[PDB]
Amino acid sequence: LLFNDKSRALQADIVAVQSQVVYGSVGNSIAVPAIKQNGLNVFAVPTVLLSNTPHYDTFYGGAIPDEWFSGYLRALQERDALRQLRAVTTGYMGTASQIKILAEWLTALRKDHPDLLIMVDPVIGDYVKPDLPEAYRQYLLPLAQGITPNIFELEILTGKNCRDLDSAIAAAKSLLSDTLKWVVVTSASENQEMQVVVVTADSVNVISHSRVKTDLKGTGDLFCAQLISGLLKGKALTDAVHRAGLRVLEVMRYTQQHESDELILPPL
């Protein structure tokens, strides 16, 4: 819309719906800083607000109440701070009810934002989380333009049973559609190899980085953070996927150099 007046509200290119930790580097707590480094602005709508990841001996907090979550999304439209919105990334969701609301918000939002790149990360592994899969299939999946599932995630989501490249690539294809343009499947195979397969309607690219064995969390969230930034900045999908992975590696090293059990972002 060219005929729209100037909005005195803040603007952001991305709305990241993920978890938030007071202490830690996961979800938006690590995503937002990363996006900010790429020179982009972002609004972070938490799914859950925890003291830290449930991976430590103790953690506190819970899932954001629907009325709240619902309001947070709505408010953004009312404050009129979505003119520059070019993408919406979804990470760890706390409940299926949240996914439905987000899907409702996204459906209505697309009507005005056609270039809206709804990237979705199918976090369904704690075997599977209850009710979360169907919610994804019915609400988010149909809207997602890109999905970054891992072997497992892709397996339960597609019901298919990937056992080899072709299989994993085939399942990916089955998810493509008029809306879903790509599927970035990843797998962590000491020294942990990170195998990534980029699948689209007219091509299948592959990338493979060697990774440091660690208990560091948020690497996936960080990856998605740099994936989306690389894309909103013009990089080719497979180019953005490659870099993103290199960036995550640069971060994990830097993090281990300072011997930190939680990710630390070094200048980008």
Ligand X SMILES: Nc1ncnc2c1ncn2[C@@H]1O[C@H](COP(=O)(O)OP(=O)(O)OP(=O)(O)O)[C@@H](O)[C@H]1O
**Separation between Cα atoms, residue 96 and residue 61, nearest integer Å:** 18
∠ Cα 73 74 77 (to 5°): 100
Of residues 153 through 212, those in contact with ligand X by CB under 6 A are 153, 186, 194, 196, 211-212
Cβ contacts of residue 206 below 8 Å, gap of 6+?
A: 195, 196, 197, 198
DSSP code string of 10-74:
---SEEEEEEEESSSSSTHHHHHHHHHHTT--EEEEEEEEESS-TTSS---EEEPPHHHHHHHHH
Query: Could you tell me the smallest distance in angstroms from the CB atom of residue 165 to ligand X?
Result: 15
**Separation between Cα atoms, residue 254 and residue 250, nearest integer Å:** 6
Closer by beta carbon to ligand X, 169 or else 249: 249
Yes or no: say if 168 and 197 are a contact pair by the CB < 8 Å rule.
yes
The residue from 14, 34, 64, 118 that contacts a copy of itself (CB under 8 A) is: 64
Closer by beta carbon to ligand X, 121 or else 155: 121
Query: Could you tell me the smallest distance in angstroms from the CB atom of residue 207 to ligand X?
Result: 8
**Separation between Cα atoms, residue 239 and residue 261, nearest integer Å:** 29
The residue from 42, 48, 123, 265 that contacts ligand X (CB under 6 A) is: 123
Closer by beta carbon to Mg ion, 220 or else 230: 220
Closer by beta carbon to a copy of itself, 6 or else 111: 6
Is 18 one of the binding residues for a copy of itself (CB under 8 A)?
Answer: no
**Residue holding tokens 């072997």?**
151
Q: Which does 186 bind (CB under 5 to 8 A by kind): Mg ion, ligand X, a copy of itself, none?
A: ligand X
DSSP state for residue 150 in the 8-state scheme: B
The residue from 40, 43, 243, 245 that contacts a copy of itself (CB under 8 A) is: 43
Q: Strand pairing of 87-90 and 61-63?
A: unpaired
Return the range that interacts with Mg ion (CB under 5 A); candidates 82-90, 107-115, 119-127, 260-268: 119-127
**Separation between Cα atoms, residue 118 and residue 213, nearest integer Å:** 31
Site string for Mg ion, 204-243 (x = CB under 5 A): ----------------x-----------------------
Instruction: Outline where 84-189 has alpha helix (H).
Output: 96-110, 132-135, 151-158, 165-175
Q: Which does 71 bind (CB under 5 to 8 A by kind): ligand X, Mg ion, a copy of itself, none?
A: a copy of itself
Is 150 one of the binding residues for ligand X (CB under 6 A)?
Answer: yes
Closer by beta carbon to ligand X, 107 or else 260: 260
Q: Which does 211 bind (CB under 5 to 8 A by kind): Mg ion, ligand X, a copy of itself, none?
A: ligand X
| Strands lying side by side in the sheet with 146-147 | 61-63, 42-50, 14-21, 87-90, 117-120, 146-147, 182-188, 192-200, 204-211
Query: Could you tell me the smallest distance in angstroms from the CB atom of residue 150 to Mg ion?
Result: 6
Q: Which residues bind ligand X (CB under 6 A)?
A: 121, 123, 126, 148-150, 153, 186, 194, 196, 211-212, 214, 219-220, 223, 245, 248-249
Q: Which residues bind Mg ion (CB under 5 A)?
A: 123, 220
